[PDB]
Amino acid sequence: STKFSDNYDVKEELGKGAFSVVRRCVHKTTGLEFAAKIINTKKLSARDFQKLEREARICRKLQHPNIVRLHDSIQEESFHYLVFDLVTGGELFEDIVAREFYSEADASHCIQQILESIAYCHSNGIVHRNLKPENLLLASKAKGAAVKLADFGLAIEVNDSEAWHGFAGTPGYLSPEVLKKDPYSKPVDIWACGVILYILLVGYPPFWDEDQHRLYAQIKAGAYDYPSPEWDTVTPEAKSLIDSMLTVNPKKRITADQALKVPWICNRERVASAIHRQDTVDCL
C-alpha cells in the first residue's frame, strides 16, 4: 500500500531499464539489505503488466541459494516494488569476458551451481527458456560467490508432458527442438547449459554465424567441434559432459539431476578444500 517507503530506506541506484530502476535498499527494522526494482506501473502496457505478474508469481515460489530470490512484491500508488536479493558481483557474462575463460576446476564449480539452480526450477515445474551468461549474476565479487539465476520473464510452468510453448529464447542458446518448432519442455534449459559450459572453458560459443539461417542449421544439426589448440588440453570428461547436454534429440539429452552426478562435476579435487580450522559462531 505504502508498505515500501514506510519499511525500507532507499539507497543508491544499481541499474535502470525501460519503465524501471533498481536501487539498493535497507529494511528499517531489521537492517537487511536488498535490491528494489521500482516499476512505473501507470506507464506499463497491458502485455508488460502481464509479464510482470507472471514473473513475480513464478519468482516468489522459487527459494534456492542460486536463484536471485524475490522477498516482497508491493504495489504503491504509481510504482510497484519488487524486493529481491542484492547481488553485487555483476553478470557472469562480464566475468567470463574479464577472465577470458575458466579453468576446468572453476568451470566445473560454476556449471555445478547453474545446474543446481536449473534442477531446482525443473523439480518445481518451471522452465526458464532463456538461460545465458547475462542472466546469471554473481552474488558478490568474492571468489566462490553463489552464481544466481535471474530474469524469469520468459519462464513457463510445465507438467510432465511436452507442449508447444512458442518460439522464444536467445538465438545462440536456442535448442534444436525450439528451432524445429517441436513440442518441448525442461530439456531446452539443459541445451543452454551446454552452450554456457562450452563458453566457460574456452571463452567463445559452440554455435556462431553472422548468417542466422546458417546458425540455426548448425544448432539443429548439433554441428560444433573442439578446435585446437585451446581444446587440446581440456579433458575428455569435460567434452563428454558438453556432448551429453548438446544432444540434439531432447529425449536422449542429459537432465540437470543426471549431470550433477557426473564425475567431472562431483569428483572432488580437495587439496585446497581439505579440513581447515573454522571459527565458532555464537549468536546467544
Note the residues at the interface with Mg ion (CB under 5 A).
134-135, 151
**Partner whose footprint covers residue 98, from Mg ion, its own copies, none (CB < 5 to 8 Å by kind):** none
115, 193 in Cβ contact below 8 A? yes
Which residue number, 104 or 151, has a Cβ lying nearer to Mg ion? 151
CA-CA distances (angstroms) from residue 265 to 70, 72, 103, 106, 161? 29, 34, 13, 10, 28
Q: Yes or no: say if 121 and 62 are a contact pair by the CB < 8 Å rule.
A: yes
Tell me which of Mg ion, its own copies, none is bound by residue 73, counting a contact when its beta carbon lies within the kind-specific cut-off of 5 to 8 angstroms: none
Nearer to its own copies, 249 or 263 (CB): 263
Cβ of residue 21: shortest distance to Mg ion, in angstroms?
A: 16
Residues 6+ apart with CB under 8 A from 51: 153
Give the nearer residue to its own copies in terms of CB position, either 10 or 158.
158
Q: How far is the CB of 77 from its own copies (least distance, A)?
A: 30
d(CA 122, CA 95): 26
| Complex with its own copies: residue 104 or 134, whichever CB lies closer | 134
Strands 20-27 and 8-17: antiparallel
Any idea how long the chain is? 284
Q: Summarize as ranges the residues that interact with its own copies (CB under 8 A).
A: 64-66, 93, 96-97, 113, 130, 132-134, 139, 142-146, 154, 165-173, 199, 202-205, 208-211, 213-214, 217, 225, 227-228, 263, 266-268, 270, 273-275, 277-284
Give the Cα separation of 234 and 182 in Å (integer).
34
Cβ proximity to Mg ion, 129 vs 253, nearer residue: 129
List the one residue out of 105, 108, 103, 111 whose CA is nearest residue 133. 111
Q: How far is the CB of 189 from Mg ion (least distance, A)?
A: 15
d(CA 70, CA 215): 36
Instruction: Measure the CA–CA gap between 107 and 105, rounded to whole angstroms.
Output: 6
Name the minimum Å distance from CB 121 to Mg ion: 16
What residue 96 binds from its own copies, Mg ion, none (CB within 5 to 8 A, per partner kind)? its own copies
